[PDB]
Amino acid sequence: SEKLTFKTDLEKLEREKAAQIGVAIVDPQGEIVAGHRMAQRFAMCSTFKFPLAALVFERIDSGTERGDRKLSYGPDMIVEWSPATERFLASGHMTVLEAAQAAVQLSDNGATNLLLREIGGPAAMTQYFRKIGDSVSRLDRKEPEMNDNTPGDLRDTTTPIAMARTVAKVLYGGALTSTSTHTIERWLIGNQTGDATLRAGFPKDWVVGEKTGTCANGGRNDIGFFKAQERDYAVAVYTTAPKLSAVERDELVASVGQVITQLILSTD
């Protein structure tokens, strides 16, 4: 009902924009609220940096990593779009927390690779997904190649449903201590890269936090959480729109925001 509209409206976007749209919305326990191609595989792009941050916190939680440990690097660690890494380059390090926060709030690629160097690489990222009960999401490469988004390639993908549930796990499911959870949640709320995407599509009174992703070949994604009408939701949106402009891809994810708002409001 609400459901059929949700679906209809996405299918219209898909048609008119020549795009594929993958969406999952779940409650804090991971129960499905609404989805579209929810188990189609989509490249993660930078959306993985959020789970990367959760993995880091889990290791801080358990005493196997320290938030203020200094990670030294040189210019070899700078990749495309590494705004904070470049700033700290001369100082010669960024802490574990500095790097995680820049990865999350700026999508800093060098900071992401610095973290991956410390935690055991893509294999370790993937292991963590498995640890939090996600058996679908997979990191196979580092930045920037993990964003190649080669048509058909299953490397470095997830499904809206698995990622939605993973988000719910970290935010509501007890994967992190109450202190880590709160911190990573504030980080998503204060994300600097999501202004023109999902949150542009949600009402202004919802508490929204999220992490965007951009891949080659028309990938544009946004995952996070929102609290509407005192209910908590985890959401994952992955889109593929090869012939749209970057701006229009932003606008497409925003439009998806709207369709989701309509569903949630109509839902009881």
- In DSSP notation, 118-145 reads HHTHHHHHHHHHHHTT-SS------TTG
Q: How far is CA 14 from CA 36, 92, 264, in A?
A: 11, 46, 20
Contact by Cβ (8 Å): 221, 45: yes
Contact by Cβ (8 Å): 36, 15: no
Q: How many CB atoms lie within 10 A of CB 92?
A: 11
Comparing CA positions, the residue from 108, 107, 110 lying closest to residue 79 is: 110
Type of residue found at 164: A
Domains, the chain, in order of start with CATH, read 1-268 (3.40.710.10)
Q: How many CB atoms lie within 10 A of CB 126?
A: 18
Question: 143: annotated binding-site residue?
Answer: yes
Burial of 179 (0-12, 13-18, 19+ CB in 10 A): exposed
Residues in a beta bridge with 207: 227
Burial of 216 (0-12, 13-18, 19+ CB in 10 A): middle
Helix axis angle, 96-106 relative to 49-62, nearest 10°?
160
Q: How many CB atoms lie within 10 A of CB 167?
A: 30
Terminal-residue alpha carbon distance, the chain? 12
Q: How many CB atoms lie within 10 A of CB 72?
A: 10
* Rounded Cα gap, residues 208 and 197, in angstroms: 11
Q: Which residues are catalytic?
A: 46
Q: Parallel, antiparallel, or unpaired: how do β-strands 93-95 and 70-72 relate?
A: antiparallel
Question: 49: annotated binding-site residue?
Answer: yes
User: What technique determined this structure?
Assistant: X-ray
Contact by Cβ (8 Å): 208, 253: no
Resolution of the experimentally solved model in angstroms: 2.0
Question: 70: annotated binding-site residue?
Answer: no
Tell me, rounded to whole angstroms, the distance of Cα 155 from its chain centroid.
Answer: 16
